[PDB]
Copies of this chain bind each other. A is one copy, B any other.
Amino acid sequence: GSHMANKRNEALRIESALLNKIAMLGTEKTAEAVGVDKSQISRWKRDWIPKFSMLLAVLEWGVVDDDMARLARQVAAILTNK
C-alpha cells in the first residue's frame, strides 16, 4: 500500500535533497560558488531552505485546467488592443 504525495511531505523531501546537495558539495564550496560567505550558506539552511522548499513543493502541483484557462483569458486581455 501507499499514500499519495502531498505538499508538506514533498517540502520535507525537497528540503532533505537540497540540504544533502549542499553538504555533498560542502558549505564553504557552495558559498564560494554562490558568492556569499559560508556563514550565509550555513544560516540559509535554517532561515530560507524551509521556505524555498515549501515553495518548490507547491510548484510541483502545476496549474490545473480551470486556473490555466483563467490565466490565458487574463493574459489574452492584456494582449488585446483597444
Of all chain B residues, which has the CB nearest A40? B23
From B43, B58, B64, A65 is in contact (CB under 8 Å) with B64
Decide if A4 is an interface residue (CB 8 Å cutoff).
Answer: no
- Taking residues whose C-beta sits less than 8 angstroms from the other chain, chain A's interface range is 35 or more
Decide if A9 is an interface residue (CB 8 Å cutoff).
Answer: no
Q: Give the interface centre of A46, A52, A60 by most chain B CB atoms within 10 Å.
A: A52
Residues in B neighbouring A25, C-beta threshold 8 A: 58-59, 63
User: How far apart sit A15 and B56, CA to CA, in the bound complex (Å)?
Assistant: 12
Residues in B neighbouring A51, C-beta threshold 8 A: 33-36, 44
Residues in B neighbouring A81, C-beta threshold 8 A: 69, 72-73, 76
A binding-site residues for B, Cβ under 8 Å: 7, 15-27, 29-30, 33-36, 38-44, 46, 48, 51-52, 54-55, 57-82
